Design a protein around this ligand. Structure first.
Ligand SMILES: Cc1cc2nc3c(=O)[nH]c(=O)nc-3n(C[C@H](O)[C@H](O)[C@H](O)COP(=O)(O)O)c2cc1C
Ligand SMILES: Cc1cc2nc3c(=O)[nH]c(=O)nc-3n(C[C@H](O)[C@H](O)[C@H](O)COP(=O)(O)O)c2cc1C
Lengths: 246, 248
């Protein structure tokens, strides 16, 4: 609770390695997270080797965390293992479909976040890389992920070599809805985002992108319609490649 | 303490007749919202259901699993790009988030919160249970909670003070989940070795017997999560994502 209240994403890491015992203890416990049908529809590829990080780094747009973190974890949706189990038990699996993908993805994210929460409680810094679903084929290729296996997210982990100011969050009245969804009026939006907009960090972000409003940075530079649409089609292509759709 | 709590965690489906105060629920949620979020955008909303008739309305969506009516609190974690797009519309920005990629990005944001919450809730002495039925009946949840365009229900968690002390369920040996550097594909020997313990457990033998099957996976493939249902649901998902504007 104190750890979560005070958490922040860490992108700069010490030279200190994460012992296999610590890492496996964290992972093993993270595997205690809820799982559809007790099935554990995930795999975690652990990348420690410098040469291997070198190869994954372009998949993640060369974010320095990949090469600088002692450990890089690729959390993967995985129905392959369960299907192999089915195949060894005279069972016909029907999990090469989007619903199963989503099911496995949820299982995977639950594990990833439990890991992150436990890693942080242990004094480690973590960073999710969203680039995982931008370049899934590069990750599939790098990590030799076979059919019914799909990388969902990637976390970089190490002992913190920075202590950044915590980023803002919206007032909870903007996120929580009592009994039904209460749509946002312009007045709601202006109230909810007033504080975010007052922060020098966000004002700089607007100015250094030559925008007038904070949302324009997100729409025009960070997460554009063009890219989102390209990535949506790519996602379908890579989902089909991995057997999660026809 | 969170690690020992997680090590010993188990899903709780029976709850004490004891309410979760707003102070506690809101504190847990506010803290859960500190979970990592793409671009710091917070692409989720949480519908909090406490009313009895609201629970009765949600119940069928969740196949009338008892926890919906029995828990003092039912939380529907929703992927939400709507709030951000409304913000865009008020700041002269043209959003392009009515697509699958953006839906998946919001979903992830949402699942991170949900699980941060569940972990915090369990640390606070509560018991939780996820309902997987959320993605079987998203339209019904959409209608029930009045989730508009760019809002999609991802998962639902029933929360309460525990009124059961169930045996912990098993997990696979970690060597069956963790792969060093690259994915190490499973041989029949690997499979047999990994699942041996699971298959030896009386619950699982009972699960097979009471389902008229010969092996554990058959219960899953033939009864619980069937090919036919999975395909139907896959199609249903595309339909509902379309209806909610996360694809054309
Ligand atoms: C995506 C997801 C969906 C779930 N759906 C249900 C469900 O609808 N009904 C239920 O009783 N439990 C559900 N659960 C709980 C699991 O059955 C449970 O996590 C699994 O049996 C392992 O049990 P444990 O959490 O006690 O270790 C779900 C869990 C996940 C992550
Ligand atoms: C799934 C998702 C994808 C993310 N992708 C990246 C990314 O690739 N690069 C990065 O530096 N941070 C990434 N993050 C971290 C967020 O940018 C970060 O959580 C946000 O700035 C809020 O900061 P905080 O975690 O310190 O509160 C991602 C977070 C989420 C959950």
């Amino acid at each position: 609770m104190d750890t979560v209240k005070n958490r922040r994403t860490i992108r700069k890491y010490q030279q200190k390695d994460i012992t296999p015992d610590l890492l496996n203890d964290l992972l093993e416990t993270s595997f205690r997270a809820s799982t559809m049908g007790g099935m554990q529809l995930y795999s975690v590829v652990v990348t420690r080797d410098a040469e291997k990080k070198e190869i994954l780094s372009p998949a993640h747009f060369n974010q320095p965390m990949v090469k600088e973190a002692p450990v890089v974890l690729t959390f993967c949706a995985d129905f392959r293992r369960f299907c192999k189990y089915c195949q060894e038990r005279n069972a016909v699996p029907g999990y090469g479909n989007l619903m199963s993908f989503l099911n496995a993805a949820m299982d995977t994210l639950l594990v990833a976040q439990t890991f992150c929460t436990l890693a942080e409680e242990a004094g480690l810094g973590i960073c999710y890389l969203g680039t995982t679903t931008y370049n899934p084929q590069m990750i599939i290729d790098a990590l030799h992920l076979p059919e019914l296996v799909f990388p969902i997210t990637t976390v970089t982990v190490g002992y913190p070599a920075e202590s950044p100011k915590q980023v803002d969050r919206l007032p909870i009245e903007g996120i929580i809805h009592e009994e039904s969804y209460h749509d946002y009026t312009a007045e709601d939006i202006n109230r909810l985002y007033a504080y975010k907009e007052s922060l020098p960090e966000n004002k700089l972000f607007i100015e250094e992108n030559q925008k007038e409003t904070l949302p324009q940075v997100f729409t025009d530079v960070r997460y554009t319609k063009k890219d989102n649409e390209f990535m949506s089609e790519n996602l379908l292509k890579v989902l089909r490649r991995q057997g999660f759709m026809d």
